Curated annotation (Swiss-Prot), chains A, B:
GO molecular function: BMP receptor binding; cytokine activity; growth factor activity; heparin binding; protein serine/threonine kinase activator activity
Function noted in UniProt: Growth factor of the TGF-beta superfamily that plays important role in various biological processes, including embryogenesis, hematopoiesis, neurogenesis and skeletal morphogenesis. Initiates the canonical BMP signaling cascade by associating with type I receptor ACVR1 and type II receptor ACVR2A. Once all three components are bound together in a complex at the cell surface, ACVR2A phosphorylates and activates ACVR1. In turn, ACVR1 propagates signal by phosphorylating SMAD1/5/8 that travel to the nucleus and act as activators and repressors of transcription of target genes.
Post-translational modification note: Several N-termini starting at positions 293, 300, 315 and 316 have been identified by direct sequencing resulting in secretion of different mature forms.
Organism: Homo sapiens (Human)
Summary of subunit composition and partner proteins: Homodimer; disulfide-linked. Interacts with SOSTDC1. Interacts with TWSG1. Interacts with FBN1 (via N-terminal domain) and FBN2. Interacts with type I receptor ACVR1. Interacts with type II receptor ACVR2A. Interacts with NOG; this interaction inhibits canonical BMP signaling. Interacts with SCUBE3. Interacts with ERFE; the interaction inhibits BMP-induced transcription of HAMP. Interacts with TGFBR3.
Cystines in this chain: 3-69, 32-101, 36-103
Chain positions carrying an annotated carbohydrate: 45
This protein's name: Bone morphogenetic protein 7
GO biological process: allantois development; ameloblast differentiation; axon guidance; BMP signaling pathway; branching involved in salivary gland morphogenesis; branching morphogenesis of an epithelial tube; cardiac muscle tissue development; cardiac septum morphogenesis
Tissues showing expression: Expressed in the kidney and bladder. Lower levels seen in the brain.
Cellular compartments per GO CC: extracellular region; extracellular space; vesicle
Length: 104, 104
């Protein structure tokens, strides 16, 4: 239940992009989820600011929430599609995949 | 109630650091909080991955949570303190202050 990376496959059919994409038919997108509380194991990649916020939360929970589990690194995907003039084009979409998460 | 930056002053006395710090007596730390849902106004600095995750959440909420509001930029502070041999030293602590937030 601690902050970590999870699996998530995204199908272009579910989003309604199947019409003009030639390949791939979907991709492994992943997602960050879980608690950012003590112990802030090093693997959880907390910043100094997160350590401070988690301590403040411990001292008076009304003053500030716990940090949130979020992506610390992302990578692009490339898709092959047909434009409106029937051209076949390769398009790069940046920040589409989660590679690592942390309490930031 | 949307994702934005908030005020948070942190006093070294509340954390028990007053013993050896010469200056300052605390600092403006800030914190990110709020919802990451449509509309993802541009000011909310969402990544492509967050847009995709928010859409997936809209299509079946059981599959994935909404993105979380987290810091996108942080700055260091410098403190003046007395070490165990009574030396006066200037120490820099990185990633201590939140400057901007987003749905990441
Ligand atoms: C924290 O970052 C490192 C990158 O060195 C990564 O390998 C690790 O998986 C990250 N932790 C989590 C929980 O995603
Ligand atoms: C999003 O990032 C920009 C930096 O260009 C920043 O000025 C803005 O305040 C950020 N938004 C929020 C809600 O913090």
């Amino acid at each position: 239940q601690a902050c970590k990376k999870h699996e998530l496959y995204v199908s272009f059919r579910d989003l309604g992009w199947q019409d003009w994409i030639i390949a791939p038919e979907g991709y492994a997108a992943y997602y960050c989820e879980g608690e950012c509380a003590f112990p802030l194991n090093s693997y959880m990649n907390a910043t100094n600011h997160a350590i401070v916020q988690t301590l403040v939360h411990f001292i008076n929970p009304e003053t500030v929430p716990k940090p949130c589990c979020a992506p610390t690194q992302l990578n692009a995907i490339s898709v092959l599609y047909f434009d409106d003039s029937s051209n076949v084009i390769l398009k790069k979409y940046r920040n589409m995949v989660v590679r690592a998460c942390g309490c930031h």
